[PDB]
Amino acid sequence: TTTVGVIIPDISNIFYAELARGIEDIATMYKYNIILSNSDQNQDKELHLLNNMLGKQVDGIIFMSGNVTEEHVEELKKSPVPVVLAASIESTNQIPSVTIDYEQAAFDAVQSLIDSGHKNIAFVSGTLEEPINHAKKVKGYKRALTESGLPVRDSYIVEGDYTYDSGIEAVEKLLEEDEKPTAIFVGTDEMALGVIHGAQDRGLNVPNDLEIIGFDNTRLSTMVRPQLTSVVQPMYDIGAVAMRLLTKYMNKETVDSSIVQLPHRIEFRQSTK
Amino acid sequence: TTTVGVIIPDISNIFYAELARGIEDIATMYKYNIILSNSDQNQDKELHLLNNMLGKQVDGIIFMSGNVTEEHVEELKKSPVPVVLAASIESTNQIPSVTIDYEQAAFDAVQSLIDSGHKNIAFVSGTLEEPINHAKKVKGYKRALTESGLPVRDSYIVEGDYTYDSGIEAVEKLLEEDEKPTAIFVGTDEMALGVIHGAQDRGLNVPNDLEIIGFDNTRLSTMVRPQLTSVVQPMYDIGAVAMRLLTKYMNKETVDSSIVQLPHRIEFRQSTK
Structure with a gap:
């Protein structure tokens, strides 16, 4: 056996x-x-x-x-x-x-917001210690902007702890930088939801104001309102x-x-x- | 060892x-x-x-x-x-x-609604085949109703299959009842998020047009808007x-x-x- x-x-x-x-x-x-x-x-x-x-x-x-x-x-x-x-x-x-x-996956995600018209896109990643993030996704986030000419203001890359609550925090922060992001790429569906609600609880509309993309195409993607566009x-x-x-x-x-x-x-x- | x-x-x-x-x-x-x-x-x-x-x-x-x-x-x-x-x-x-x-648990929930003045209260259950539902939850659901003089209506007891979408499906059927309910007790949170969302996708508000109470008090409770009242x-x-x-x-x-x-x-x- x-x-x-x-x-x-x-x-x-x-x-x-x-x-x-x-x-x-x-x-x-x-x-x-x-x-x-x-x-x-x-x-x-x-x-x-x-x-x-x-x-x-x-x-x-x-x-x-x-x-x-x-x-x-x-x-x-x-x-x-x-x-x-x-x-x-x-x-x-x-x-x-x-x-x-993960590299290209993260690139396409951001790449699509560019194409949609977004100049300054934010990025919510998980523990920058895990290579999935600092190594592959972030590089994908930055390669999308750098490649399109847009600048990489490090004030647009905040770390969350894969928690829905750390998702709601990431939004409050990014919604404080003088230049308020128009799009945010989140590395996780759970956090993404926190990003969404955090932005809605501030009276913002997804996506007429803030557009968002999550990762994993998890069961939670279609359990939020608005439904989460995510990387499958x-x-x-x-x-x-x-x-x-x-x-x-x-x-x-x-x-x-x-x-x-x-x-x-x-x-x-x-x-x- | x-x-x-x-x-x-x-x-x-x-x-x-x-x-x-x-x-x-x-x-x-x-x-x-x-x-x-x-x-x-x-x-x-x-x-x-x-x-x-x-x-x-x-x-x-x-x-x-x-x-x-x-x-x-x-x-x-x-x-x-x-x-x-x-x-x-x-x-x-x-x-x-x-x-x-489970029986008293189901009873307190629907009692809390009756105590808010509700009279037309629904129940979105899991598979009635399971003893957890037919022997306990629905029993407690009815007790609280029969103990307050409120009628028990077969139409109000809708079955689901523990899935989010089944909850979406349950609110649609309930809302297409001549005697529209004002509160709905749901046997599960995942289903409850569906009842909530399903209601909002039809213009209804939560809790001003419909009040719902979940069950289990899983993290999903706090990952909704409005967050979910749930039986712990x-x-x-x-x-x-x-x-x-x-x-x-x-x-x-x-x-x-x-x-x-x-x-x-x-x-x-x-x-x-």
Whole structure:
């Protein structure tokens, strides 16, 4: 029999949960059994779990993290079972990964506000410590403005903590800079909602005044009013392409493509014109 | 060295998620490992998983199901390990469980509306098949009505399927009733956000044209405008109590109360006056 271990950062986070769930639906069909164990986003419970898992005789692991350190990549470069990352970074492309190009994804998002006429666009990102942000999305945010000639006033990039409440704070701040942004690209659907309500509670209208874009195309995108235009991430595909990938290293049937990049898209709703 | 397993219907549901968090934190105090698995609210996967645990070497099991069929308990009556339900009833009162008084809970909500002067009050339930609804929530919904002289109308009791959109769908049907309601009690927050939004997409205001009260008091309550008045369920505490009680069972200590009901409450916000 075969049992794979799945470890996610925040059991609460609606993106890692829908993802983890999808993987358990796929494992059901593979007849594999899953041992799910939360990480609580702290770098201490992760490695500790990477150890816990082997202490449970797993045959392979699906790994998800906001920040995959070099200390992480090394420890992860010597496991008695295979391992692959689901929607996580490792811009060195050393360990198995199935994600989307956050870089361009973040670029298109901002790119569309430009085209809509927006000169000064803001950006609400998560912990600038996680590479998904400081490395890929921000670069996407800045490459959109710099490439179009528009300036990158660092006063337009505020950090939130993936919380709806930190979303409502980010809006109050950005709605204080003399030059009030006309568009805001948020890196998360949850925060985005906080951005929206925060702007509505100030008497602003989405999107006739402030236009907004979220990330993940999460169930919450269509549970807000106005509906949130968001960057779609191939849910089932990230998990399935990852599990069959893990099945190869588990059956040793090695393949010439260890760094899978699935395509993205943007779901335009009402948060933009 | 002992571990413990928890079976939840949908790790995607922020509801069952705010609870598994409470069992974990009591586990990192009692020293056991925490194993989880998704049920999909499907019978096939339940009794099944109820045995998969008998293979992953567990010592106790925390179970949560919208419908604990009389057969589930039967197939659970032959468990090689202690079982104790969480936030899920049965009506057989023989297998260990920790919940709240769903019936009184439903009663206080609709009473709070009647006490605001409402007379035409609706109820948007989850699948009436589940005992959690037909045996408890609707019962309490009617009690509060029949105890105040208010009529009970079949048209006012609309079924849904725990989805946001089903709530949208429920407000449309209710609003197309000659006798239009002024308040609506909803069995779930996710559905309640749909009832709220659905109302606003039709020009109605919240709470001046319609007052609604959710149930569970999940984070969704505060991610709406107007924020949602919801019946509170001690999600965290339910876990802890369940854990401590499963503990007694595995450590072979006599239990003086096999069935536990914690208190409930109502957190009023602005979806209510």
